[PDB]
């Protein structure tokens, strides 16, 4: 079939501060492998390349290489901060639960951008940025601090808990899938090839270019 060759880059996502390390890692890896499979499928030999940046492409990596694509982002979740409910409890109410909660939801923020570039020269042949704020992404979650007068309450009676963690899950899934779903959209065998002739030329212009002088 096709003899071409693309080079794929490393994602390059930074995150906002409440996104565990190890999730920040899956997403990384999960993002290069499935980009991965989205290129084989198109009938492309993919080449894993060691970093982030086109410039630290080898001339072998250069050479062989029809296309570059490069991923980079900032995934941000932070609460809608109009939805934050914080009831704590009411003492003596006829039922008085000891612990104090609060109450939110999750919203996604930040870009991740696609971009497909020549390798000798460097130049972007096209990229499309998703706007992760357009996703409509509301992932409630809730954290009880354990409260102020409730000191006599024996342990028992005092478990808090946080379901943060399980809210970040679920909004990086959604916006997992959302992002390699555009993804899936732009880079078709044909939108690819439809860059061979500008992929060409700037080869040739910059192969030239250290030929000379």
Same mark, same amino acid.
């Given at each position: 079939?096709?003899?071409?060759?693309?080079?794929?880059?490393?994602?390059?996502?930074?995150?906002?501060?409440?996104?565990?390390?190890?999730?920040?890692?899956? !997403?990384?890896?999960?993002?290069?492998?499935?980009?991965? %499979?989205?290129?084989?499928?198109?009938?492309?030999?993919?080449?894993?390349?060691?970093?982030?940046?086109?410039?630290?492409? $080898?001339?072998? %990596?250069?050479?062989?290489?029809?296309?570059?694509?490069?991923?980079?982002?900032?995934?941000?979740?932070?609460?809608?901060? +109009?939805?934050?409910?914080?009831?704590?409890?009411?003492? #003596?109410?006829?039922?008085?639960?000891?612990?104090?909660?609060?109450?939110?939801?999750?919203?996604?923020?930040?870009?991740?951008?696609?971009?497909?570039?020549?390798?000798?020269? #460097?130049? $972007?042949?096209?990229? !499309?940025?998703?706007?992760?704020?357009?996703?409509?992404?509301?992932? +409630?979650?809730?954290?009880?601090?354990?409260?102020?007068?409730? #000191?006599?309450?024996?342990?028992?009676?005092?478990?808090?808990?946080?379901? $943060?963690?399980?809210?970040?899950?679920?909004?990086?899934?959604?916006? !997992?899938?959302?992002?390699?779903?555009?993804?899936?959209?732009?880079?078709?065998?044909?939108?690819?090839?439809?860059?061979? +002739?500008?992929?060409?030329?700037?080869?040739?212009?910059?192969?030239?270019?250290?030929?000379?002088?």
């Amino acid at each position: 079939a096709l003899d071409e060759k693309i080079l794929l880059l490393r994602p390059a996502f930074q995150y906002s501060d409440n996104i565990a390390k190890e999730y920040e890692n899956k !997403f990384k890896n999960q993002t290069a492998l499935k980009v991965e %499979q989205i290129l084989q499928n198109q009938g492309y030999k993919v080449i894993s390349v060691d970093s982030s940046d086109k410039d630290d492409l $080898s001339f072998s %990596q250069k050479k062989e290489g029809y296309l570059a694509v490069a991923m980079n982002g900032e995934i941000v979740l932070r609460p809608d901060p +109009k939805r934050t409910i914080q009831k704590k409890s009411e003492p #003596g109410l006829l039922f008085s639960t000891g612990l104090d909660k609060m109450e939110g939801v999750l919203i996604p923020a930040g870009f991740v951008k696609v971009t497909i570039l020549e390798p000798m020269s #460097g130049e $972007s042949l096209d990229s !499309f940025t998703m706007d992760l704020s357009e996703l409509d992404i509301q992932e +409630k979650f809730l954290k009880t601090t354990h409260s102020s007068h409730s #000191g006599g309450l024996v342990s028992t009676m005092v478990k808090g808990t946080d379901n $943060s963690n399980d809210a970040i899950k679920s909004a990086l899934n959604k916006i !997992f899938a959302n992002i390699m779903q555009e993804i899936d959209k732009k880079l078709t065998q044909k939108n690819l090839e439809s860059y061979q +002739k500008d992929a060409k030329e700037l080869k040739g212009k910059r192969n030239r270019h250290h030929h000379h002088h």
